[PDB]
């Protein structure tokens, strides 16, 4: 598939007062390997991150375009975006090309800029929103981390327990996919800080 | 996917399942498919979920701008009319299968709408992957001038039959009854299926994963 | 027309616009701690007219409202543009529009409509009210497009004396809906015949949203209160 | 379904027509707890109508002054202002009629500060006139004359001497 | 003055002078009479020949905008040709879209809309031609209409336009055309034309007569030559005996 | 360059051309009056024929704009017919794209916006006719509306339009002061007497046009000569 | 039907651009000073009235991006349209190039588009003048002044106020070259607004001050709070107490 041309794996998990968002760092062309230092999670808020898996050029293009529209929005309003509003913006941007769609799965994870309510949602190749309270997914190794979700999730995580759970989830998901892995970046977003950890993974 | 609608003596009863699927896996276990159209008209969507969402949203939108331009309550067949023009202009490339139900000054109205633009008026309609089981339930049990609670039970058991007989339908049932004097949206009418309990403990304890590089950014 | 700069650096066209607005219908707005009241006076020319047929306030949405002073058909077409613009904001955004945003949208619309040639610029002034994020909002827009923030103001006929009166009144701490009685007083200072059941229109925007007042409670507030 | 809201017609009218004071107060407490069920405009108009029904009827002041006080406290529960100023206008009229001397002057400190916040005349004029009349009732020319002149500052605007400028004269 | 040079500006009294100048330009031209008989419509126009060098029959103001509809012209002839072309193509579009002969009132409405649309703006001047439309069918009888450049389309039993329009409609009114057949209508129209020719005020003239009706089987056409060349003949017996 | 010729604001913003258009409407020496009854609405318009040569059936100022709504014009005839056709177009467009009989207010609003965009720009005549609609709306009864070339409108219990405007309004107001449930034949009798006392002509039955739309007959209809003279001889003694 | 408004003067100039100049001449007042450590811009907001809500957070200041900021004078509507165009073109540059525009490229884009507006079309020019304050890696802190005529330049400290040339004259007489000294620059702005504005006593509820400074690779842009503004003001008028001490000597 054109989805499985580059691979890519994005996960986001919900905690009690925090969120987690992890992604594989592998970039390559099919079985050929290009670089193990590719960026899929992008910070567009003080507490609000977007994970993007899919076509790497489509990831970069939609990231630049949403940053474009986002800072235009924030300069126009004079206020920070809400995660629900960002979900609406992602849906509108992705649906603007229904006959010409970008080949990617966006994932939105963050806290409320005023109330610090956790928020996680995922959108398809045409911008249908799935706002969840437990987990959202993106990638070629989707069913692996689906199993990780349904066998590792419990409500009201501690941020460290959140980090460990999503770390083991992403590691065991990418260990069975030949087109995902090469190091995992994990962000834990809470009210007063954000901690990003690069995990030790399999390099084969 | 299983959506349905029934005309009863005082209005419309709409029902739907809450299972949203991608490929073979189910994506959303509590998806909402009954969509807000106007304070007297609602629609249930099926097929491509984003397509149904945008279609119901923009049609509904033109519904309240019409109401504000007219200063009066909107009607159902006007909504159906611009649904069918919006679908027919696009030659069915947008796969939105719709059930429109409402009550206006002319009375209750119910319609089934195809993605290619064909529209039908019936006292009872079914749509979705599990349309046939609910249609069989209705053909077995519907009679004209149905009471409200019995119609609620009929729609609920038809959606349950579509859930338990069609693979693309499952999880919960949501209802919406529209009357002249009231309107109630019973999102989780019944919960027929629950998640099984967990036996083993798979708690990823703290310190299980090693870290190469770290950063911490304090927030204002 | 292609109006340009005078040797004095003044646009005589927008001066004529505001002069025509100043001869328009008197109206008043006040922002209290629980919402915004807008109020206006409609003097029907004869008993032949129907007061309920045409209104002076129009709901853009559940929580946004705008009264006016000046031209009539200009006001109704601007109501159409404002409603439609707020609606595509809701289309792209799927959340109700805040007040100040549609304020600069309509101010921009005024800027091109006084900028583009061929078209005569508009001869209306608009007053906007809404309830966004708990804090109420009331603004004024001129034909030239310069939008101002006012917690209490008067626009239309004899607006300067009303402004001075609300300077004497309106300590801006009325947490209750007593400022509507102050608006009734402000209109009664310029009312021609009497404060009646239909000549005065009053609109409120509270936490529940913007709601046009039924003339029953308009007659109620006309009674006893003043 | 609220049709008893306007149902002060029979008994409320017959209170004034027949003439009785205790039954008026009993009606005032009769709809007093029910008063927090209707619109605020209807509540204000109903309170004003019931109060000025018997505020001119009878001099049996064993109930009426605390009825006015409890209506002030009800107004503070509603937090309505012009309602309030009308109430203390009524009580200072009742106090001048009953002539209990002292705290009528304690009206002024509780009035003037409020009436100089806004350019208000009619309430200010009547409270100044009644204060001057009460202070003359204790037979002290200087400060009563000073209050009379202070009322005579507001010798402008208005529309007529309906009750105001004729009482000034 | 500055308030008479545009078709989009208004006089203080509520008048447009461009269309009034158009009316004056129309009435400057010579005369033309349309008449409705019991079965059909007859058109009678006189045209002044300017010199014998013309090969006769030049710029005849009668045109066949439709097979079943004829029309008569006074005013400016180029605008008349443009309107005739518009009428022909609109009848063509009607019978292409609908598949039957267009009613006279409908096409009169369409050309009225067309001539009034050119009065709206200032980029185009009002026209300088007033014309008449006549038709007959068994489905509706005989129909006659008259349209001025301002856009007023009125039906008539008998109508006239031109310099001698006053005496023309005067002598139209003194005849009971509702009872006379087409053969009498021809001689009446010829007599009225000869009366209103006025002789001394103009040069030599020529006559043009056109027919529509059941005698022509509803298809509009010019008069035959044998029906012609008798107009002068019963003129010369009906001339004044001094 | 001054605005006495083209639509621009003035000192005190007086758009001279719109009052000029109002005088252009008053140039045509005709009048119409519309009266709404309890369950009926009537439009009574006078006409004049200069001669018997013209076909009197061709001259008509009342038009069946839809099957349930009637309209009547005053001003120059061609612009009147033009905006009749435009309102016809918009009514048919609404019926096609919505599927129900358009309420009278929506037609009124749309052509009011059309008049507004006429008078908004230059290079466009701001039109010279005034308009009356009569109709029936469900749960509303009869409705009578009026439009100007400036795009203004309102709701009227009864109104009039023509040269002799003001005395018609005064008579109508002093009659509606004692309104008291106007009935159908009484409405047409009052309208006929109003037009008669305004014109002081005591018209014969063949000089008038009457159009009545009723709740009992929601289809808009045109009064024939027989019932016209029947109502005249009904109002002859009174 | 008579509107040319696009042709040169019989002597060579343009009537429209000079009418725009004297239209800016009676507009509001805003001034800016460059420094080595940052840049400040102080304005007086007009129509200071008790009934204003003042909920726009220094409306005379417009943050064009995270780095470079704007101020405008003239017609408010044309100012809004123009500043929206500046946001559009700047963020189009950010889209085409994943780095901020330095300072001057956007200024040149504005000068181009306003020249095209005053070249043809037969429409009125936008009578707005703007001040641009920003930072770049190429030249540090950079300041520009865009007149509506299209001409622009790199003045270190200037204004477009109703007393523009007056404050330019006091700046020229009283500028220290190469000294950042941000507190002294604030004092300079305070005394300039003192001497230039006709009103006295320097009400903090009549003025606004915005500051831009490079910090941790972010170029933080702040608006001075009301308490800070009045504190700086009161420090300014108590500074002039020793000036009136020489008197006889």
Coordinates of N, CA, C and O in Angstrom, one line a residue, chain E residues 60-110:
Chain E
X60 N -38.3 48.6 -47.3 CA -39.7 48.4 -46.9 C -39.9 48.1 -45.5 O -39.3 47.2 -45.0
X61 N -40.7 48.9 -44.8 CA -40.8 48.9 -43.3 C -41.6 47.7 -42.8 O -41.6 47.4 -41.6
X62 N -42.2 46.9 -43.7 CA -42.9 45.7 -43.4 C -41.9 44.5 -43.4 O -41.2 44.3 -44.4
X63 N -41.9 43.7 -42.4 CA -41.0 42.5 -42.3 C -41.8 41.3 -41.8 O -42.8 41.5 -41.1
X64 N -41.3 40.2 -42.2 CA -41.9 38.9 -41.7 C -41.0 38.3 -40.6 O -40.2 37.5 -40.9
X65 N -41.3 38.8 -39.4 CA -40.5 38.2 -38.3 C -40.8 36.8 -38.0 O -40.0 36.0 -37.5
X66 N -42.1 36.4 -38.3 CA -42.4 35.0 -38.3 C -43.3 34.7 -39.5 O -43.7 35.5 -40.2
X67 N -43.4 33.4 -39.7 CA -44.3 32.9 -40.8 C -45.7 33.3 -40.6 O -46.4 33.7 -41.6
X68 N -46.2 33.4 -39.4 CA -47.5 33.7 -39.0 C -47.7 35.1 -38.4 O -48.8 35.5 -38.0
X69 N -46.6 35.8 -38.3 CA -46.6 37.1 -37.7 C -45.9 38.2 -38.6 O -44.8 37.9 -39.1
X70 N -46.6 39.3 -38.8 CA -46.1 40.4 -39.5 C -45.9 41.6 -38.6 O -46.4 41.6 -37.5
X71 N -45.2 42.6 -39.1 CA -44.8 43.7 -38.3 C -44.6 45.0 -39.1 O -44.2 44.9 -40.3
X72 N -44.9 46.1 -38.5 CA -44.8 47.4 -39.1 C -43.9 48.4 -38.3 O -43.9 48.3 -37.1
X73 N -43.3 49.3 -39.0 CA -42.2 50.1 -38.5 C -42.4 51.6 -38.7 O -42.8 52.0 -39.8
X74 N -42.2 52.3 -37.7 CA -41.9 53.8 -37.8 C -40.8 54.1 -36.9 O -40.6 53.5 -35.8
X75 N -40.0 55.1 -37.3 CA -38.8 55.6 -36.6 C -37.5 55.3 -37.3 O -37.4 55.6 -38.5
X76 N -36.5 54.8 -36.6 CA -35.2 54.5 -37.2 C -35.1 53.1 -37.6 O -35.4 52.2 -36.9
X77 N -34.7 52.9 -38.9 CA -34.9 51.6 -39.6 C -33.8 50.6 -39.1 O -34.0 49.4 -39.2
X78 N -32.6 51.1 -38.8 CA -31.6 50.2 -38.3 C -31.9 49.5 -37.0 O -31.7 48.2 -36.9
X79 N -32.4 50.2 -36.1 CA -33.0 49.6 -34.9 C -34.1 48.7 -35.1 O -34.3 47.7 -34.5
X80 N -34.9 49.1 -36.2 CA -36.0 48.2 -36.6 C -35.5 46.9 -37.1 O -36.1 45.8 -36.8
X81 N -34.4 46.9 -37.9 CA -33.8 45.7 -38.4 C -33.3 44.8 -37.3 O -33.4 43.6 -37.3
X82 N -32.6 45.5 -36.3 CA -32.1 44.7 -35.1 C -33.3 44.1 -34.3 O -33.2 42.9 -34.0
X83 N -34.4 44.8 -34.1 CA -35.5 44.2 -33.4 C -36.2 43.1 -34.2 O -36.6 42.2 -33.6
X84 N -36.2 43.3 -35.5 CA -36.7 42.2 -36.4 C -35.9 40.9 -36.3 O -36.5 39.8 -36.1
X85 N -34.6 41.1 -36.3 CA -33.7 39.9 -36.1 C -33.9 39.3 -34.7 O -33.9 38.1 -34.6
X86 N -34.0 40.1 -33.7 CA -34.3 39.6 -32.3 C -35.6 38.8 -32.3 O -35.7 37.8 -31.7
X87 N -36.6 39.4 -32.9 CA -37.9 38.7 -32.9 C -37.8 37.4 -33.6 O -38.4 36.4 -33.2
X88 N -37.1 37.3 -34.8 CA -37.0 36.1 -35.5 C -36.2 35.0 -34.7 O -36.7 33.9 -34.6
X89 N -35.1 35.4 -34.1 CA -34.4 34.4 -33.3 C -35.1 34.0 -32.1 O -35.0 32.8 -31.6
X90 N -35.9 34.9 -31.5 CA -36.6 34.5 -30.3 C -37.8 33.6 -30.6 O -38.1 32.6 -29.9
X91 N -38.5 33.8 -31.8 CA -39.5 32.8 -32.2 C -38.8 31.5 -32.6 O -39.4 30.4 -32.3
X92 N -37.6 31.5 -33.2 CA -36.9 30.3 -33.4 C -36.6 29.6 -32.2 O -36.7 28.3 -32.1
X93 N -36.1 30.3 -31.1 CA -35.8 29.7 -29.9 C -37.0 29.1 -29.2 O -37.0 28.0 -28.6
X94 N -38.2 29.8 -29.3 CA -39.4 29.3 -28.7 C -39.8 28.0 -29.4 O -40.1 27.0 -28.7
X95 N -39.9 28.0 -30.7 CA -40.4 26.8 -31.4 C -39.4 25.7 -31.4 O -39.7 24.5 -31.7
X96 N -38.1 26.0 -31.1 CA -37.1 25.0 -30.8 C -37.4 24.3 -29.5 O -37.4 23.1 -29.3
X97 N -37.6 25.2 -28.5 CA -37.8 24.7 -27.1 C -39.1 24.1 -26.9 O -39.3 23.1 -26.2
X98 N -40.2 24.6 -27.5 CA -41.6 24.3 -27.2 C -42.2 23.5 -28.4 O -43.0 22.6 -28.1
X99 N -41.9 23.8 -29.6 CA -42.4 23.0 -30.7 C -43.7 23.4 -31.3 O -44.4 22.5 -31.8
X100 N -44.1 24.6 -31.1 CA -45.3 25.1 -31.7 C -45.2 26.6 -32.0 O -44.2 27.3 -31.5
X101 N -46.2 27.2 -32.7 CA -46.1 28.6 -33.1 C -46.3 29.5 -31.8 O -47.2 29.2 -31.0
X102 N -45.5 30.4 -31.7 CA -45.4 31.3 -30.5 C -46.6 32.2 -30.4 O -47.0 32.8 -31.5
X103 N -47.3 32.3 -29.3 CA -48.3 33.4 -29.2 C -47.8 34.8 -29.4 O -46.7 35.0 -29.0
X104 N -48.6 35.6 -30.0 CA -48.2 37.0 -30.3 C -47.9 37.8 -29.0 O -47.0 38.6 -28.9
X105 N -48.7 37.6 -28.0 CA -48.6 38.3 -26.7 C -47.3 37.9 -26.0 O -46.6 38.8 -25.4
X106 N -46.9 36.7 -26.1 CA -45.6 36.2 -25.5 C -44.4 36.9 -26.1 O -43.6 37.4 -25.4
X107 N -44.3 36.8 -27.4 CA -43.2 37.5 -28.1 C -43.2 39.0 -27.9 O -42.2 39.6 -27.9
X108 N -44.4 39.6 -27.9 CA -44.5 41.0 -27.6 C -44.0 41.3 -26.2 O -43.3 42.3 -26.0
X109 N -44.2 40.4 -25.2 CA -43.7 40.6 -23.9 C -42.2 40.5 -23.9 O -41.5 41.2 -23.2
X110 N -41.6 39.5 -24.7 CA -40.2 39.3 -24.7 C -39.5 40.5 -25.4 O -38.5 41.0 -24.9

